[PDB]
Design a binder for this molecule. Structure first.
Ligand code: MN
Lengths: 68, 128
């Protein structure tokens, strides 16, 4: 499976982006930090699709995908 | 953002159009024009001088996703901010909107405060 990491989030974005990700897939192993958010992705959505939706709110350099 | 930014509000229900116009008025934006579907929006956009498009999703003749794709493939207005209005957050539609170049999307019914946050986020991203 794959892991997504979101950094340099401003106030309210950690909750907001968990919710946005919620609409697109089911997240496991969620870790909500003060200004960061990481979670494991099922693999039922292309990552480019996640990035495009998440980019409605943040920048592309704040999103990282990696093999767990 | 320039308070006299010209808006094109698109929706097949005149009531929804009046609602959006009043909400924009509540935010200080009074230079607003209306359209009833995607075709009618492309026709008015021809007059030029538009700064923002707020568009409904489901409309007859030409829907919002097709209007968006058309604005984005047109060299003269390809960078025009387009905010998509939908009645439900649903994966297939959000992805479609993002991948087609939507500046953002908002779920109706929405408040003036939600509209302000949406507009401000787009203004920040585009440097307006
Ligand atoms: Mn409609």
């Amino acid at each position: 499976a794959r892991r997504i990491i979101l950094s340099r989030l401003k106030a309210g974005e950690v909750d907001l982006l968990e919710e946005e990700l919620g609409h697109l897939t089911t997240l496991t192993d969620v870790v909500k930090g003060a200004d960061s958010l990481s979670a494991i992705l099922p693999g039922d959505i292309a990552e480019d699709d996640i990035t495009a939706v998440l980019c409605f709110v943040i920048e592309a350099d704040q999103i990282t995908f990696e093999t767990v | 953002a320039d308070k006299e930014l010209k808006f094109l509000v698109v929706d097949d229900f005149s009531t929804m159009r009046r609602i959006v116009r009043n909400l924009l008025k509540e935010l200080g934006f009074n230079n607003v024009e209306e359209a009833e579907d995607g075709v009618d929006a492309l026709n008015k956009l021809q007059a030029g001088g538009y700064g923002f498009v707020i568009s409904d999703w489901n409309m007859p003749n030409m829907d919002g996703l097709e209007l968006l794709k058309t604005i984005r493939a047109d060299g003269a207005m390809s960078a025009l901010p387009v905010l998509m209005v939908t009645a439900e957050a649903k994966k297939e539609n959000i992805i479609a909107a993002a991948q087609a170049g939507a500046s953002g999307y908002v779920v109706k019914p929405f408040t003036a405060a939600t509209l302000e946050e949406k507009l401000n986020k787009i203004f920040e991203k585009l440097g307006m």
